[PDB]
Symmetry: C3
Subunit: 303 residues, 3 copies
């Protein structure tokens, strides 16, 4: 038993290589407030997915903080301890610490509540993120569906395969949603269910944003059949909620847009967009018997 | 013969590792209609490539469907069987299926031709994609040229190399275009020829969009010379045309832009951009003799 | 000694696999000119980082060439030797070479200095890049800081780890900046220091743009402790300055924006943005003892 079995279980036979992959992704679903005889911006795939595509990944804008009607000028910093001031002292004029968004004048200017903060020359008013809004603005996004289409290639063979298996069909695929118990190959996932299979609740993760991984895992013993090489799915949170132990901000990005009247009087407005980012983290290795390399590997065992 | 030859052919000697890579890409070429004394938007690299860069990849906008002059409001759905209606029945008021772009009122509203469809509260009018325009709008894109610049690094060595080989020169590189028979190292490819070397015709693939892979393949026996480690090129289609057997849509994306008068009356306009996406799918393994690890590997053979 | 030691040093024991990774990046810092009682656009993270995110990578806009107030029409080509003309000859009417941005009329039109160039139908005036401005416009970017947050996963284990090590804390992390001699684990790098650790000077590399790699390298003997698996950092230039020996342009991209009056009279303006691109090139392999696969590998040694 021993000698044959150990090589046969271990697979020193089968020649193996790691997988070359390509991906495309779409989100589908709509969100709204009010109805007929009324107006409120209805949300679709052309709004909430920006940027429209990324390599192996996509974003969903779950919650938004709005910075409005800016010009460049003079205003107070936000009340945070590292430059809350009784009077000017460490806030050196003509200097700007790496946390900041503007340059000191040397003045501890008055500000409401806590009675003063250090001044900055900056875009004004400053960005305030002291209270990330709750509930998360795009609360309806839990129900949206992500389509993950993936093609795998093995350079050690003429082989390739598409994650939409060769027996899935139109009238099913227009309404299937993935479930590991009943539909192990439908390429469509429901965003709330991506996060729930990772053990987190989308109700909360949507507030401050985060990063989410669809681990499309490929592993094939290519000896059997092309009909029998198959994908398996798993889901992982990739940020972490270790606050005060710290991690810098929960995942977000801070794009802006900018405008003028005909007379040229500039403004920016800035969106601190909090969201969940979905990374389609494909990985695989696959093996095929192949006698030539096997004879060497098993040859060490044959001695 | 046997014992030495099998190890010598197989390369249990040579120590090997898989490649760390970076890429940059530009497209060059122009497209037009009309001439002097006339006006029609002339197309260049600043228009047709959007988004301007992506990781290991780029897009070319071959064909465009235009959704115009929108507001949020009340309008019919497109005539497709899953909600063509004789009268209201399954189209439940206050509900929206995952195919859709708006919410039911419960009314099977009249619409022209096929006499009715279910209503949605939505962006209106709805997106129509029942007839992807032919010939493809940017027909001239077949002649455009993509420059692929790639640098490879092997962490098991101090080694790196640039795919623009160390003997290519200015006056050649300003006009070379790749051909596997005569110019195996020119970094410039012609888009129509990328697709033709994959066996497809750009004349048709430009209509409904798709995904295309430049497999820049590196494989070196580093023992020989740095002058003799070299890239090899190959081209693969990565989407598939298995319609009715289905694949969801052919590759496209659906960005939009949005506007107001000074009085604030909003619009969007939405581009369903169909195109070819080019993925610069670099992969390599390379090997160098190295006596220390060889002595172990060949040691199993020496027994 | 020999038999045990060679297997024990070489690590045919320990089972090993290559790493699955995710990344997020932010830049922080500000740049300015003039002060109070004066106006000049102040620069922050919402301006200079565009595009707002990319997979494993980010851009910093170090230097900008401006193409202004365009319409489509008739104008001369830039004075470059491959179509500087004494009179019309090779510049065939209705043809456009792959270097160009417009189509020949067959006329060698007059132009100032060198007295003529071939005409193009084009966007006009043409893009001029004959003198990349010096010093680089965003000179202050040397002082900006990039935060690199990286999570690693090993599919051969339940294992994962975050590059912000489990003993880094808030009040340090709000002001640490990386240095291989004193702070080997702070996730924040200073852009000028990224380039200086690669041996180049940011003072010059900022002029014509280029590509820069933060090689976050993971290598763990997982036997020891999760507390003792640790990242190591290194920095590499990935473009090259081999001019005249050539490389096509130094790294840049050429986005544009476009506008109309209410009457619809179109313009574009085009930014040839030169910058440094930062690629967070994570790679790792890690090994853990594991007796089952070891017994096979060492079994060849035991014979
Ligand atoms: N320009 C803008 C502007 C603006 O300038 O008004 C406002 C924006 N939000 C927004 C948020 C709430 C809104 N109302 C509202 C909601 C609840 C109760 C009562 C009233 C309304 C609106 O009433 O329209 C508009 C955005 C952008 C973007 O540009 C933008 C770009 C990309 C993604 C998202 C956005 C975005 O959210
Ligand atoms: N805003 C717009 C607008 C608009 O608002 O008019 C129109 C657009 N197309 C378009 C198409 C055809 C056009 N004429 C035409 C062609 C044949 C025969 C007769 C007449 C004309 C035009 O005559 O100018 C314009 C686009 C955008 C984008 O924003 C845009 C953004 C990114 C990529 C592409 C586009 C785009 O194609
Ligand atoms: N639209 C624009 C426009 C415009 O239309 O005026 C001008 C732009 N530059 C710019 C450069 C210099 C400026 N002054 C100045 C500097 C030194 C001495 C004296 C005067 C001023 C300004 O005075 O404001 C403005 C940009 C954009 C973008 O759209 C843009 C988009 C993304 C990144 C960068 C840019 C950008 O640099
Ligand atoms: C496509 O055909 C295959 C045939 O094997 C179906 O396979 C499923 O395989 C998993 C194990 O990998 C089983 O747990 C399931 O029970 C199988 N399905 C069924 C219906 O028994 C696959 O399901 C087929 N595709 C569809 C859409 O059913
Ligand atoms: C750069 O130098 C090399 C020297 O080997 C040229 O190599 C070509 O190599 C392939 C095989 O890999 C041969 O089929 C070609 O015939 C070789 N070229 C020639 C001209 O014979 C390479 O072509 C050189 N670069 C250029 C631009 O010619
Ligand atoms: C977190 O704890 C570790 C404990 O090992 C600190 O480890 C540093 O490890 C390197 C070698 O990898 C040594 O050269 C350093 O001297 C160690 N640091 C010190 C302070 O001695 C690590 O530095 C700790 N984190 C912080 C922020 O200090
Ligand atoms: C900006 O805010 C002011 C009031 O603070 C308002 O008058 C102005 O119209 C706003 N700008 C725009 C473009 O809405
Ligand atoms: C939108 O269409 C209407 C006619 O349906 C037209 O009057 C209006 O000017 C259009 N809007 C714009 C901004 O062109
Ligand atoms: C474009 O330039 C002309 C002068 O050449 C100027 O009159 C016009 O106002 C400029 N356009 C804009 C929108 O500034």
């Amino acid at each position: 038993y021993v000698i044959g079995w150990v090589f046969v279980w271990e697979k020193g036979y089968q020649e193996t290589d790691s997988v070359v992959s390509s991906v495309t992704t779409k989100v589908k679903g709509v969100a709204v407030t009010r109805t007929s005889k009324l107006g409120f911006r209805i949300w679709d795939v052309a709004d909430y997915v920006i940027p429209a595509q990324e390599e192996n990944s996509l974003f969903v804008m779950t919650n938004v903080i709005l910075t409005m009607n800016q010009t460049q000028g003079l205003c107070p910093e936000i009340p945070d301890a590292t430059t809350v001031c009784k009077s000017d002292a460490s806030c050196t004029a003509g200097s700007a610490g790496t946390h900041s968004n503007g340059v000191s004048t040397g003045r501890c200017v008055a500000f409401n509540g806590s009675v003063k903060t250090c001044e900055v020359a900056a875009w004004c008013p400053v960005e305030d993120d002291t209270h990330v809004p709750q509930p998360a603005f795009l609360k309806a996004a839990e129900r949206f569906t992500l389509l993950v289409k993936n093609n795998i290639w093995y350079p050690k063979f003429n082989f390739s395969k598409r994650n939409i298996l060769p027996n899935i069909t139109t009238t099913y695929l227009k309404s299937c949603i993935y479930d590991a118990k009943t539909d192990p190959f439908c390429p469509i996932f429901r965003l709330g269910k991506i996060v729930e299979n990772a053990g987190h609740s989308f109700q909360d993760m949507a507030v401050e944003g985060g990063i989410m991984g669809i681990q499309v895992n490929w592993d094939c013993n290519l000896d059997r059949a092309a009909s029998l090489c198959l994908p398996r799915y798993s889901f992982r949170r990739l940020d972490t909620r270790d606050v005060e132990h710290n991690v810098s901000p929960g995942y977000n990005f801070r794009f802006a847009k900018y405008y003028r009247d005909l007379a040229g009087n500039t403004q920016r407005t800035l969106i601190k967009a909090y969201g969940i980012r979905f990374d389609i983290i494909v990985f695989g290795k696959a093996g095929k018997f192949d006698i030539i390399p096997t004879m060497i590997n098993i040859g060490s065992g044959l001695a």
